[PDB]
Amino acid sequence: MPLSNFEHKVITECVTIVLGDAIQVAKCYGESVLVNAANTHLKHGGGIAGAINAASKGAVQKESDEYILAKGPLQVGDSVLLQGHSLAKNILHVVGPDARAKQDVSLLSKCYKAMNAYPLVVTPLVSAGIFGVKPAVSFDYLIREAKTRVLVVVNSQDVYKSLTI
């Protein structure tokens, strides 16, 4: 019962909202895929990406740099499955839209659809931090697309209360 370690609320038979650190939730499930909310160049400086990279001792950034050098940068809405680096079975790097740049928020549908390839996914709310989309809106796109087991982890009690009220 890994979720007994965290306040959580089951929303549907697919989606559960969890209050905590997504990295610590994923650590509890060896078969989970952890979602990174990334940018087009996989530069993991801050936000959840910085935290995931630090937890990997910088290995995530090294792997990402090699990928981007070989393939070129990603487009908004793209996703790439990369190594898990002992944090999870794999890390799925998704490029959410940046609302500050007035990018198309509906591209979150593409980000969240990519999660359905995996039986168990631990994800933050993509675009809801640096990229300026409201948590409740990011959640709307997630719940519309989710067809697999998804633990949506939010690290703010204010957003947790807002989504579970």
Ligand X SMILES: Nc1ncnc2c1ncn2[C@@H]1O[C@H](COP(=O)(O)OP(=O)(O)O)[C@@H](O)[C@H]1O
Distances (CA, A) of 143 to 37, 40, 53, 150, 163: 17, 24, 27, 9, 12
For residue 47, state whether it binds ligand X (rule: CB under 6 A). Answer: yes
Q: Which two tokens stand for residue 151?
A: 């633990």
Pair type for strands 33-38 and 90-95? parallel
Residue placing its CB nearer to ligand X in the complex, 63 or 126: 126
155 part of the interface to ligand X, by CB under 6 A = yes
| CB closer to ligand X, 89 vs 122 | 122
- Our finding on whether 97 is near ligand X (CB under 6 A) is no
CB proximity list for 14: less than 8 A, separation 6 or greater: 146, 147, 148, 149, 150
In the complex, what is the shortest distance from the CB of residue 108 to ligand X, in angstroms, rounded to a whole number? 9
Q: Which of residues 23-42 bind ligand X (CB under 6 A)?
A: 23, 37
Provide the β-strand partners of residue 35.
92
Q: Is 105 an interacting residue with respect to ligand X (CB under 6 A)?
A: no
Q: Considering only 1-9, 45-53, 63-71, 100-108, which stretch makes contact with ligand X by CB under 6 A?
A: 45-53
Integer Cα distance of 147 and 165 in angstroms: 23
Q: How far is the CB of 20 from ligand X (least distance, A)?
A: 7
Binding residues (CB under 6 A) for ligand X: these are 21-23, 37, 47-49, 51, 96, 124-131, 135, 153-155
